[PDB]
Design a binder for this molecule. Sequence first.
Ligand SMILES: [C]N1C(C(F)(F)F)=NN2=[C@@]1([S])[O-]2
Ligand SMILES: *C1(C(F)(F)F)=NN=C([S])N1(*)[C]
Ligand SMILES: [Cl-]
Ligand SMILES: [Zn+2]
Ligand SMILES: [Zn+2]
Ligand SMILES: [Zn+2]
Length: 233
Amino acid sequence: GEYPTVSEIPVGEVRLYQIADGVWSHIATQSFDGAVYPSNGLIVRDGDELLLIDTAWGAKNTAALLAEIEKQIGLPVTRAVSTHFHDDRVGGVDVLRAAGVATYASPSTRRLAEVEGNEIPTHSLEGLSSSGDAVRFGPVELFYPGAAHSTDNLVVYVPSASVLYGGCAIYELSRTSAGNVADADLAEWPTSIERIQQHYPEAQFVIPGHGLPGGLDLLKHTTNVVKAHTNRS
Ligand SMILES: [C]N1C(C(F)(F)F)=NN2=[C@@]1([S])[O-]2
Ligand SMILES: *C1(C(F)(F)F)=NN=C([S])N1(*)[C]
Ligand SMILES: [Cl-]
Ligand SMILES: [Zn+2]
Ligand SMILES: [Zn+2]
Ligand SMILES: [Zn+2]
């Protein structure tokens, strides 16, 4: 396993990891309350351009992300999708926009970002408003599994590569306790995860919002952690 961790990534830097032909994750680090967290997004080749999924958690990181993509891949990022409204997913949208990247999110995400005072993707993704809804967006399928980590969270599937990117609705195996769930729907989260399993049973690579990739085993792991948190006392 050659996936990078926080020790191999000074804050302000970004690593790319090739998961499959024409599919990468981008990995960045960010500090919070004296601890350092890794964070994942996705990059998907579409012909001679690139689709970006999520920012690198801030303006500085996201600029570094664009510089690393150009250095290592050398194809233009034409579109970006943010998978929910929190700052680690839309933080850096203004940088993308300034660089000429068309930015996208569901209308639900755009609204919530606005309420939070966060950066707001330009474009609104139709067809994702009800749990179980999917739309094609270039080389990926976008799926709204229902509320989980947030009410607006999306997941992304790359059918050519069998790569499922769960964003912050899916926990890495090393995470044994609930993360930040201030905006979560704990009641619905397991149900939302099971929709993901039902829709992508053939997924071979599962990328959590933070940390190490794995397989579909990450879904039940996440459900277990969420349910234990639910019963907390
Ligand atoms: C990490 N995270 C966040 C912040 F804001 F803190 F950054 N949000 N959500 C999560 S997971 O996403
Ligand atoms: C763009 C482009 F062309 F990719 F830059 N900007 N807004 C929309 S919609 N598109 C396709
Ligand atoms: Cl645009
Ligand atoms: Zn979040
Ligand atoms: Zn546009
Ligand atoms: Zn996150």
